[PDB]
Amino acid sequence: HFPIAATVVDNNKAIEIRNFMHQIKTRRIECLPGVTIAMSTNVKDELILRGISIEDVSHTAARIHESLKVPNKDLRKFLDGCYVSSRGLQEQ
Amino acid sequence: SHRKFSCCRKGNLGYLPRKRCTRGRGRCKTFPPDVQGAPIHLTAFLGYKAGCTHVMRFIDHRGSNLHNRQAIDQATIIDAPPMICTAIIGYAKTPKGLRAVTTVWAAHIAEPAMRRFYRNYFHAEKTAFSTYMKKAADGTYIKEQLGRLKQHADVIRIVAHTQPALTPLKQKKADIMEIQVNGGANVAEKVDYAYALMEKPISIKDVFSVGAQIDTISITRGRGFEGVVTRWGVTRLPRKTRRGNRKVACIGAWHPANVQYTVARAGQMGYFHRTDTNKQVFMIDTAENPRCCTTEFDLTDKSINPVGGFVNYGRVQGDFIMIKGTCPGPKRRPVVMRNALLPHRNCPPVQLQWISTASKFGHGIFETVEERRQFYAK
């Protein structure tokens, strides 16, 4: 019922998040250096993190997940958020 | 046993001891923090408390119950004749804090500064800076001595003094104070700016601006020896207490077998060193301007001095500054003014519609002497 908005900024070195569950606070998450973040150009509502350092790529995705928390509610019913779906290598 | 009902302690333990202040005047202990790259500017000034009045102003707030209405506010007036910069000091940040490099004085020093070096001036033999003036005569020595502050200091301050022959005060010796130079591009640019101020006057309009916030530092009114009801604000005992009801009844439990430093006791009240923060500037003007305190709302010409004169202060001759609210001390105490360390964020702008110039000796009803004369015109 509330579409999340997501704009890559800083030339893929930060991301902003707006409108999470219709909220006024905005979210800014910067990438650990060496990591880039792009919107999916294939399948909608999906982000892409890429880098050589696996700790750096996973630490950024977890810092995004930790930024979108629903307070004071039954989380088993309110399930909005950003969730890691694929942990793999690139495919060139 | 436990105290049966809940009630806080009386008074603030962070303003201890309640002793008389031993510093001479208010002393600025901190300066605003320097920002590398910022435009150069001065941070402090020294004035004397002249009086209080009230003003009418138009409130431009948002969400407030006074959003587009008129309010009457109390303002304080501070007399600020120009200060003279006489010396430059530098300091270095070391593993033991701030240590000074050297202090370079000016070639020629005025009488108000020279009197502060002596107890009685008429009787004393005058040997202050006797050798210094001879050596420093040629300006080369200053340039070499400034050749060190450019190479070793992180912080630069100027030494400046007031001119007490432009006030109604009794003292003839100046009050000397360091003023820190903030901003600039590097240290070496703050010493070219300090040299260009040597032996020159500095006006308060060139430190503070209208609508900014300042901190006021001074010494409070004195009351001498005073008991606990007034000194600390404890409750007064009932009427039939045998030996008097202006006391604390129990001053400690049996154990520990000493009196604690947290218990209220009688002693010196007032004459303390204090800092009141976040004061908004209302107006910066001069008393020679005869139009200084005239809005359009009045058609006569009104200036800063009231009908009858400033009660218990005297006459204001030159520059002054006006702050909203109140500040410590009686009339005629020296007040130090600095930029606000952590200013208040949501303060509206300043838009003055009227200022009171009626007499404060009694209940005066005439803005000007001219229209009192027209009233009693026979």
Binding site: - | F297, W354, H363, I365
Partner: protein, 65 residues
């Protein structure tokens, strides 16, 4: 500036001075000082108090338009 006239005497009142009183017949009274308010409450006649506007008008010293 905007001003009021004292209701007991005839003087002008400047912004931020005196006090007002709301009477119960829905009439407002504006006083210049406490002296003027004590004179009114005691029911002292304005014409007999020689420094008021009302007295000087009744004594010919004040011109009535």
């Amino acid at each position: 500036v905007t001003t009021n006239q004292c209701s007991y005497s005839g003087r002008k009142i400047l912004p931020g001075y005196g006090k007002r009183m709301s009477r119960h017949d829905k009439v407002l009274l504006i006083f210049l000082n406490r002296k003027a308010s004590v004179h009114y409450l005691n029911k002292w006649n304005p014409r007999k108090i020689r420094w008021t506007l009302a007295s000087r008008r009744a004594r010919g010293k004040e011109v009535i338009v």
